[model samples]
Target chain A: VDSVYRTRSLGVAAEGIPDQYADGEAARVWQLYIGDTRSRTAEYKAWLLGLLRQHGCHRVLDVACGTGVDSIMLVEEGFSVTSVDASDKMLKYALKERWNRRKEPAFDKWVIEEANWLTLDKDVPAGDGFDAVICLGNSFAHLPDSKGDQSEHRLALKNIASMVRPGGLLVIDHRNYDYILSTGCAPPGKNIYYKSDLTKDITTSVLTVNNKAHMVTLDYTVQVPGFSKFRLSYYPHCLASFTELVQEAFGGRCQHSVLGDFKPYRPGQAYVPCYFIHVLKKTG
Target chain B: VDSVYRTRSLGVAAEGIPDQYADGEAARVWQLYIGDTRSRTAEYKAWLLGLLRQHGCHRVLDVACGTGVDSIMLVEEGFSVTSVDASDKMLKYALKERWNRRKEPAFDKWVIEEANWLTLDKDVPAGDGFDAVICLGNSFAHLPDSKGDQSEHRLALKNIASMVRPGGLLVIDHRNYDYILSTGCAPPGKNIYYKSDLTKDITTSVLTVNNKAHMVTLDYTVQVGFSKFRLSYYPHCLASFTELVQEAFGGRCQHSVLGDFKPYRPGQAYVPCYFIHVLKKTG
Candidate 1:
């Protein structure tokens, strides 16, 4: 499959990139929006390290591990890491990145596998009892939500919860929907783009947003000098609703601890809720 | 500064930039909008070379040598070159490119310096007497439409015309504003990000059009992991208006408005998104 995806062509004549996928490397299109992992994702890395340390994490699970950024980082940080994506195309790029990284790893101990979070009976190659299951990219919204039902979303969490040991952690993070949902023109940061390129940070060029279907849709685009407009979209996956799903699915075994943009929560302080850093403690 | 431009203070966050000077690496901004110059501008380059050779052009002058893609490409193609730009920021990038490029010259003789096109009694670091002087990249519009006039436009051309020897050329190529000026559309091949790698071509991410007093605006942008929405707006200068300057400076005897072809075509069937005007000084 071609690594490219096409949006409506702009200008009279579209140059280079196929109006459709070329050799079906459609997943490489992910690179345009996904910021440089090491530089852009410092905060995420900080949050991840803190969670892993405080929780004494050993085995880690990365779901929807797009293009191997989080996957390879975890492997370099020396965890028994299992990175999984639903798309074989995406997984190809994920491994491609893994193979090229200069991370002199403590061990090359990582697996790139295919799994879907939304599927009820989906099997994970890592099986169960991962010390921590990580779903960082805002990709969990791929769970079905037709007819206003989040049961598909529920089933995915139910399945993920099964993999946690009695004292494991599950960290879920994504775009802060509540930020905009509460009349915020942008997410909790001063501005999404500026916050990204500061002395410490990494990010995407987001386009139009629409409220439609059973969701608020975030439509984005990545345009480069030689490539076609590869448009991508995501329905705003709400955080509170996600926490509720995890609360319902983990069922008495895990308690959901919410953190904001890697900071410990403070009562009576404005919680930007820029990221839903939910740490699930399996304490049956 | 409007709120739109002032999100961080539009038009004013104008740091690291010269104002009204949206001389303003605006053509350089085309560098971001359009793809690889060699790959995307292949037709333009092909036509330009053939035109120059057929016309027996020797020395060349590049005005607004944005990032020096054209200035360097032409010099490598064996033209005695003098590239002048108003913005040092752009010229700096251009020089860095000129030094690193493999086009190791028959002679590394290209002059690059700062000079405004809009100033009255303008200066040319290349001096006069050249076979051709180039003003491509739609950057000519920066020649000033302030207070609703093209005095700077006229003065820039008047100064550039002085640099061309008798029978020398003043070549201007850019996106055809005529197409849009008429009804709002394009006149050519867009840039290729990697079509260049894949197929041998390159192009801009121009998004919208707005018609305002004294000009029509084509708002473009190049967005990456950003500090802000790095945007650029180009208010177009028309073909007839540009030709008038040459007639007013170099005279009508050598004035020609050219529409490029596939390997070469004519008007209509090939309404190039860009218009190439060749005004030779018959004096």
Candidate 2:
């Protein structure tokens, strides 16, 4: 079968595509621009650390580990980490930036692989299971649209469950669907407009998935004076309830817990859109 | 010395006066309505409980106790409570209500007293020390204006600090003055608002003092169907910071800590108006 994960070249029209590939280069850039600079990541890291300690998980698998920022932090904190990404462009950059720092013998414990996370059973070696799996940064939304059936979302969860050993945990952070539904769509206009001395023109766009579904597409346009405009797009999807999603996806194989902003979700508590964590324990 | 405190007769035909004491009861009525039913009081109580535990305080004094809602809660939670109120009518109502609910002996720990918090040295008897002094419901703003000097605000703080034994705490919940200043003043307005089932026409006037201070006066014209019209005025006031008042009053005797609906303030963090804890040490 043809590789569905193939990268397409933007041709001469796309000016910013770099010429050469090196390890950790792309990951560093991605981290600097989108991951570490955002306030959401700091809050997520604090929450993830607490939850992992709660579940007593010592090893973690980072699915679609872009730039490996989280994977690096997890490994630094003494967790055996396996970082996987399908994109060679992204993996190459991550390796370039992270490999030199991990020269010590302890670094050998980390496994960096390039593979499809949705087919983890085929890609990851069997019997080398992880205590926890983290799919963060809304990479789950990047799965090709399933024509409204959400087979992709279901399959991703199934694949993630198979990778964890029984009694292991799974933590997934995604946009909050309930919050978006209640608030309705963002007011029509330039969703985000900014011009500052340190930064250039920044315009953000909001795209609704459908009237029925809560998924949204966010497009960020960054323009610098005398420089080219940078356009980055992410689906920015939301799920109805992490509790329902985990239960439906994992079936009866695991127990599930949902959290809102580092705190466990209490009954009748409202959902906040920023950060949500889910822990699934496989039966021993 | 002439008394600076203002008093008016209900029988007087002043433009703001009403025929009966109940005639001008809207302010207290609205307060009871909001304090009893709203989640705000629960939030404050949780915050206070956390602070008390953190500082190892077992006894609390609710200064300007108003309707004594918090005092009742604290006593039930096993804390020895002394409830004080400036208004005789409010204190009478609080005591009567406490008596009516006499089934709970836990509430018997509450010592109800009538005291003017501003004139704390005069009103609060000596030897009624506490581990914590709580002044909630914007009662701190009722301090008499001392021009720009804020001597009354300072004196009230000193009194509250004096009540706390060494290593004790003082918690005060006040209106968000910074929020009000940032949002600017709401223009004068009139409307009949309801608390529970009691509806009252409210007329509000905003006044500024010393160019830095703002006081809002709320005049409620309430009527219970065919009942006679009731008039009550509440002068809801705000000051920029409790730290300012604490600094002036306690000097080096107290330290200011801000909590965001929680008991303890972490280092290098601040929150808009919620509650502040001032710790005092015995010399």
On lDDT, the candidate that comes out on top is 2
Which stretches of candidate 1 lie above 4 Å from their native place? A1-20, A23-30, A38-41, A101-107, A125-128, A184-213, A221-230, A266-268, B1-283
Candidate 1 residue lDDT tens string, A1-284:
86842222221111111112322332344343344344545556776787788878888878767667666677777788887766433454565555344234543356666576655245574455789888765566444354455676677778777777778887776567666555533322232212433121112223232443344333222343444223233345566566777778788667777776677756457756565567788884
The models' CA-based lDDT, in order, is: 0.55, 0.58
User: Would candidate 2 be rated incorrect, acceptable, medium or high by CAPRI criteria?
Assistant: incorrect
**Model 1 accuracy (lDDT, Cα):** 0.55
Clashes in each model (backbone N, CA, C under 3 Å)? 35, 10
* TM-score for chain B of each model, two decimals: 0.69, 0.70
What tens-digit string does per-residue lDDT give for candidate 2 at B1-283?
1112225433444555443444444554544444442233445566667778888888778887776766777877898888888877668767976898777887655689888756777777647467888776566765645454666666667777677666666666555445443343322221111113445454433333213333444444445332222222222333345455456344655656454554443343544444454556644
Q: After superposition, how far is residue A53 of candidate 2 from its true place, in Å?
A: 2.8
Which residue pairs in candidate 2 have backbone atoms (N, alpha carbon, C) closer than 3 angstroms, thus clashing?
Answer: A23-A92, A23-A96, A24-A93, A24-A94, A24-A95, A24-A96, A24-A97, A25-A93, A27-A67, A167-A282
Candidate RMSDs in order: 15.6, 23.2
